[PDB]
Amino acid sequence: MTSQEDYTLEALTAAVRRFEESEDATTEARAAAERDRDYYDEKQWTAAEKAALERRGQPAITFNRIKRKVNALTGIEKQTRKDPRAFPRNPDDEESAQAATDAIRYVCEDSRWDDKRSEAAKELAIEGTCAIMVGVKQAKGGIDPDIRRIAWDRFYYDPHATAFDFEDACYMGVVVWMDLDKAKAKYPQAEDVLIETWRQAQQSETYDDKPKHRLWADYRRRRVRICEEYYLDGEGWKFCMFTKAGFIVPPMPSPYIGEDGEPECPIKAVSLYIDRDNNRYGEVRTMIGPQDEINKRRSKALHLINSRQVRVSPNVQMDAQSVRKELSKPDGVFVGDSGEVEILPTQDMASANLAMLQEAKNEIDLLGPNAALGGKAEGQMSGRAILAQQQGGMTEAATYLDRIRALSIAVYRSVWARIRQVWTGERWVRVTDNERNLRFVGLN
Amino acid sequence: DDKPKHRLWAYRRRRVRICEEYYLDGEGWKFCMFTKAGFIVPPMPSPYIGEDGEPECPIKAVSLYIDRDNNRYGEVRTMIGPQDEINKRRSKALHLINSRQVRVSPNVQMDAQSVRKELSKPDGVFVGDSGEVEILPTQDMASANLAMLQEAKNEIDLLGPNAALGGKAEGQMSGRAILAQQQGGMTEAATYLDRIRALSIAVYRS
Amino acid sequence: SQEDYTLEALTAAVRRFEESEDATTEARAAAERDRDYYDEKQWTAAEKAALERRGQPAITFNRIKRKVNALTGIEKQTRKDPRAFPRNPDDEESAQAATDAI
Amino acid sequence: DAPTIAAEEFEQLMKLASTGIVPIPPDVLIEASSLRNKPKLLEMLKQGPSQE
């Protein structure tokens, strides 16, 4: 077809500028979070160190300890699972709470809120940012509120936001990768802005497709990236959908009515730690330091052991390196007088490296969770000491549970607002099985 | 492919491969039996009804850990490294213990390797004066390799399920700490238990 | 046009299966390595040949199997039955039906 | 965390009745439980007094 396009550059720049600054301002934080996640995923060696170890013949061995602490924190959060509840401010409002406590609960069982909360907590432990979308979905009885989980690498926010729930954030959005056929089926009007994206980006791989190497997007399975962004305009919150080539949905007011009857951003995001540069990081960062000392000192102590240092007399008619390699072998031989070869001592180096490795292991074990909440500790200690260490670790983990609680409360509030916005009388009767709940239909 | 990985048919049987595929297009879920030759079952809407009354994929699957590259793995990957280190250090200590390093004077009319093999045997002999052959010390290497192996054993013990949860004391505690250690192990395995519970719930709903 | 549609659908299905198989090659290889390691196959062919040439027997000390068995036994001891609960009291009997069905 | 609101309600009834501070009649208690023979128990408890 003709498809007259390429209207102007100003419109495209104004459309993609917010995503551009979101990508640019959080490059270091995203790289650090990706490194922490890779450390959690049994990837604690760089390419250069692995190449050097392969060159020297030493295998690369990783003693992963971050995963144990992250699993302990996640299990602690799982064991403290709670249910949504509405409490009446005054006795005459009691029945009103008895409505909401039901309705919200239904949503938390319709969307499997437990699993989404669990993965949100996992990302909070690892990357320090959780994003939950409170939207709508089609059901048999009508439209129902729906809870969706946004991956840390598929969600961008206002870099200038300082609060941990993003009260002051000007905008936030989600990147979604969709097949071209599905995109055309879902939005046939915006066929002129859906452009193939086959080339992978190496400078910024955070918002690309999860499988980096995909040799099927040429013609077989074409994939595109679409950004859904909600931004606080002077009039109010506005929602838009766009791509790198244009606007899928032109800037329009947000369709999700908020708590106070005004359009609101459905995305609820929480963070664990914020630095002086507004970079958000999780607890895994604290374990990044010692973990390397667990690995590197492991390698060096192994290198000092399978190799020997020898001084060779110049009268020897053999290569020094060959003689050293022969003497390093358990069944090696040498032909010569006593003084031709002298083995220098290197046991002190290995012993010192082993002691430093043990010290680093103790430090990481005490670091973060006290290692007793995971039932590991250090041994040779009484039960009362174990309980005291577990209580101390639980106290040190109060902020994590507080973040989870705040995210849950925000999600429940958005769920109640969406229920008031979209539920009808028939849905109220079908779900709650109470006639009086028809009083609660709509916001008036 | 076929599990036995033999496929002799010298013929014994005839094995064929089919693929069931459930795929969600723009309008809904479809199911198809196919091989590379053709369609055993033509693409049709899925004959299984979901929660919402629409066709849905009957397969319910779960995974333990997901990598940044959409890679899925279990708990064995953590213990892969320590097990390799244990085996390698064990083999190195075995090689070091049963072998000796000898420096042989150039005035010996025998092969150096043969002399080393003779001196490595418990009942070996050598002919010559005092300075003909010298035995280099290698016990430090074996002892330190054994220490590294013990450290790797401790690491692999502390890596997976708790030893106290697994029935191993390793320290002979007072018994009260055993209950707390088991509670910690349960906390660690809570993620795995939740995965199993979610899979069971999905299966029951289907 | 039935033949063309069937050919296109078959090509799409085969392509989908091939893409799924190819994109997970490293993950499948790692999972197979872990499974073999659990099944006493913790030594490579080259290292086994080197040990055989050296005359040193290949000895395997397996500790992964113990942890896997402990986890499986824990999961077995925390077995639970399916259960249906009613959202409202009037649904009570209905839930019972599911409890008698599933 | 409770599977249903009725389960938490029954647990609260247990907590109130165990102390013995307030008198909780057994009919409402059974109505709030999750027993399969609940209609039979309710009918047996709510049956009218004997003509004697």
């Binding site: 239904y106 | - | 639970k80 039955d81 009613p86 | -």
Partner: peptide, 15 residues
Amino acid sequence: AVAELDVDILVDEGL
């Protein structure tokens, strides 16, 4: 319907 999932029936694990 009469008994749909998450509307009238909640599926969980019991003893």
